[PDB]
Amino acid sequence: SYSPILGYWKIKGLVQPTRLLLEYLEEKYEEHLYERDEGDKWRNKKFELGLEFPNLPYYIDGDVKLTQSMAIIRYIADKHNMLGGCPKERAEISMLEGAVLDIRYGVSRIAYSKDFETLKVDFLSKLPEMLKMFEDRLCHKTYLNGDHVTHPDFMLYDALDVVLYMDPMCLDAFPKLVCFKKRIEAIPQIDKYLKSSKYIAWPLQGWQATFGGGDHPP
Template structure:
């Protein structure tokens, strides 16, 4: 089996759940991390790499050249037994991933706005409604679709971690989400990766973002 070729910016963003999946699956892969100083290089090269829809992140598996983060997670999930069983699981996994990313996208939208601090208070009710929906969906299950991991669990973990930075204590009302996060990051391969120097801690978002951006985390108050 040839190595997967994975590429994304040198930040967490949309790439981190894919990194977690690759580590958990345990397959060999090479990763290309584009620095903030390499934007011009990426935009100059992207249309010469043979992708139908050139973008980051991308994954190359032999003759398969894949872009769009949700397609990459779905592909890896199907190939490595992380996509559930049957139509009901397919639907639930896709809906959960979409709901998680809706919250993250809404956060990204306001954090890239110059009026972030003014917009944040009005956004918080929407943020907590999203968490409430995720908590209700998870219920008393170990993972999103039951006792077995699926690819959306990797997306959920990464985003819960970011949400706790965005709004410290936000999971206190949702003990099932806190339990999920603790259990997930205790998985041996995930724990080893998160504790390694290969795991990106910061930035969480685009370098220009008002939250999760820059090159170093803000000093704790």
Template sequence: MDGDVKMTETSAIFAYLGRKHNLCGSTEEARIRNDMIYSVTTSNRSAFVFMCYNKEHEKMKGPFLESLGGRLEQYSQSLGKRDFFGGSELVYADFCVYDLLDIWNQFEPGCVEKHENLKAYLARIEAIPSIKKFLESEAGMKKGPFNNKIAQWGNQTL
């Protein structure tokens, strides 16, 4: 809820907040990059969540970890030498990517380490004053739970 605005659906909420806070990209290229990386991140999150909630989680973990390097490489290549996925400007997809990379790094510690640009990217996001303040708070230091209690992984505070 935002005043008289009542919404459901994560994608619609992200797009609304992105427009409201000028986080969709100021150029057509930045808007296209935002849309693409948001879409890729939604797909990657869905695959990860499917594995986390699946009763065959342990069987699925190996294949997921085998694919994780390629997924991270895709993000690394897409980011390239840019500061953010929108180029020099922050876009709402950056928050989605940050969240997913952080969760993956909890799932498979150190998985981001071989991608210097992704490590620097995570540090840039964490240096945003409001995010830095949150991460230094008691709530921000707590890791998890990432999923509901019925999940096979990420259902408890780490």
């Protein structure tokens, strides 16, 4: 059975937590990566993939042809029996999910604004309230759902990576989160991935973004 395909821009963006989950699980996959100058190339292929809701990212494995980043990461998790063993645990994991997205989408939704520098002040003013809930969550816990890794762990990791670019001191007040970020980096298969040529360091958002864009870090 062939390697499934993960299609996306050559950026971190929406799919970075999925990459980390895949690498955590030591799953084989191949990426179809779209470059900065391949917009027309993508548009010419977008409607020729059998996708119900054509978009990036997409995931194709011979059983599914998916779009929506959260459907994709949840499918991979689900195929490894990680979404939760009953309605209460599935709800817990979806709740963790959404709370992470409040941070990650909080970034994405202002990153392309001409008025980023201003909107950034409001986001960073609210951010400690969001981080505090995760700091608390990690009291005497190894991962967000206890002693075992779940996909929101990699979502949170990505969110922390990204907000540190917006303000390198924003975790100084949250030592358990700083520790969590290091703990994820100390998973050997993640360590190996981050050191590999498959790791995409930059950009964070699309290249044209005001925050987290461009070909290289500022």
